[PDB]
Amino acid sequence: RLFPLRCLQISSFANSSWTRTDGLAWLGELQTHSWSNDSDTVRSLKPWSQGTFSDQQWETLQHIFRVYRSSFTRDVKEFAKMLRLSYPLELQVSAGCEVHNNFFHVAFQGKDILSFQGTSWEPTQEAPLWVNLAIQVLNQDKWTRETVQWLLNGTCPQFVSGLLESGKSELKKQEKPVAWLSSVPSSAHGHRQLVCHVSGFYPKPVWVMWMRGDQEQQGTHRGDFLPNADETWYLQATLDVEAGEEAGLACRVKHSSLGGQDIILYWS
Amino acid sequence: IQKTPQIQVYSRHPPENGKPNILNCYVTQFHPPHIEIQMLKNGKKIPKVEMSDMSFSKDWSFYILAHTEFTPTETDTYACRVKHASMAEPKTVYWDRD
Numbered sequence A: 001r002l003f004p005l006r007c008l009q010i011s012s013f014a015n016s017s018w019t020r021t022d023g024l025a026w027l028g029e030l031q032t033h034s035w036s037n038d039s040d041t042v043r044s045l046k047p048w049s050q051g052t053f054s055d056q057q058w059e060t061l062q063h064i065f066r067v068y069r070s071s072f073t074r075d076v077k078e079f080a081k082m083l084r085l086s087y088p089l090e091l092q093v094s095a096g097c098e099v100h101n102n103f104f105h106v107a108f109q110g111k112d113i114l115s116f117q118g119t120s121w122e123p124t125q126e127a128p129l130w131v132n133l134a135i136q137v138l139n140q141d142k143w144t145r146e147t148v149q150w151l152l153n154g155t156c157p158q159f160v161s162g163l164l165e166s167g168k169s170e171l172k173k174q175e176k177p178v179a180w181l182s183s184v185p186s187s188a189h190g191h192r193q194l195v196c197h198v199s200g201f202y203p204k205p206v207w208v209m210w211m212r213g214d215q216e217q218q219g220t221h222r223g224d225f226l227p228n229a230d231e232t233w234y235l236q237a238t239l240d241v242e243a244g245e246e247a248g249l250a251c252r253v254k255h256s257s258l259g260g261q262d263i264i265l266y267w268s
Numbered sequence B: 001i002q003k004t005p006q007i008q009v010y011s012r013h014p015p016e017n018g019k020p021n022i023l024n025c026y027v028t029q030f031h032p033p034h035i036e037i038q039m040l041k042n043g044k045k046i047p048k049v050e051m052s053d054m055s056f057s058k059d060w061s062f063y064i065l066a067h068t069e070f071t072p073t074e075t076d077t078y079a080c081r082v083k084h085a086s087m088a089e090p091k092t093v094y095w096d097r098d
């Protein structure tokens, strides 16, 4: 059970006059922090979002991020005029660590351009030529390279360790799924698509399969894990069936929260 | 480059007429992150809509969850409409129930 900390940044630049920066933090699958552009403060979403960190340790990081946001915006506009890059600009930052390695990845226009490796910035394997010129400028900033190295290797590992302990009760929580059936018409004539919805389960792993007797139907199509507003998951498994061959069909659901008790839903 | 938003509409609880429920609209795989999302009841924009903070997957594409309280009936229809730069016309996906 791994719970990596993902610090996400979304910075957009429409013109030389308009710019937004919004951020957030993920511990596993739970969002722990919200950093709105309109706020001078990184908002905590949970009672244990600070972890072991005292309020004084937390305000230190608070001011650092506040300076970073204003400085990041300035540098990008400077890099735009310098490297002769046209607006609009889209930048995304993915940073954080997992306690048992750390990472810093930035992306330009949805594509990787550079990352922070060791003690300096390095361009990605697939990266345009102008990136190397930006790296040369970034690497001259000795204070930033020391601060990032101090945050990723010093501040982050102690912070995640503080989060996992202070919020072990919510991270290891178990929510029971609820299932129901429906049927939309199929693309082919004489066929029907049965849908088995599964919602409200946590954690993510779950097992859904359409059944006849003890025989698993390989025609079952598992969907994607869709999120709910209450930090639970939604999932549906479909099955195309002929008209008249719908009898005997059942949807079986297995989840860790049920304690070895299957959820069975026979059709009609 | 630009990426077309994928839209998925689903309810939180088993849909039952006359019973209050939650409607979800999950938009994924879009870029740039600038996007407009509306949830519709009978064609009209639902005012009480909350949206989670926009985030992005491992591949740099964005995703965002929209949800609202709704009480499904026989005659009422519900849909999620999305306006993005990757498309010339707004994309509308209806809530499929039976």
Ligand SMILES: CCCCCCCC/C=C/CCCCCCCCCCCCCC(=O)N[C@@H](CO[C@@H]1O[C@H](CO)[C@H](O)[C@H](OS(=O)(=O)O)[C@H]1O)[C@H](O)/C=C/CCCCCCCCCCCCC
Residues within 6 Å of the ligand: A007, A008, A009, A023, A024, A025, A033, A034, A035, A042, A061, A064, A065, A067, A068, A069, A071, A072, A075, A076, A079, A080, A085, A089, A091, A093, A095, A106, A108, A114, A134, A138, A141, A142, A143, A144, A147, A148, A151, A155, A156, A159
């Ligand atoms: C884990 C703890 C936090 C948990 C809670 C998280 C809350 C949720 C938020 C999530 C969002 C997280 C995403 C952001 C990542 C976190 C922040 C890490 C980086 C902190 C950086 C601190 C350092 C900093 O702000 N530096 C800033 C100020 O630097 C200082 O500026 C001074 C002048 O004002 C001086 O020039 C000084 O140098 S001197 O030698 O002359 O004195 C110099 O060191 C500096 O501007 C920041 C640089 C950051 C660059 C990062 C970008 C990477 C490359 C991207 C380039 C894009 C260019 C493309 C253009 C199209």
Ligand SMILES: *[C@@H]1O[C@H](CO)[C@@H](O)[C@H](O)[C@H]1NC(C)=O
Residues within 6 Å of the ligand: A019, A020, A021, A037, A038
């Ligand atoms: C986002 O916040 C920054 C911080 O001051 C501000 O300059 C900018 O105007 C804000 N963006 C919008 C669209 O208001």
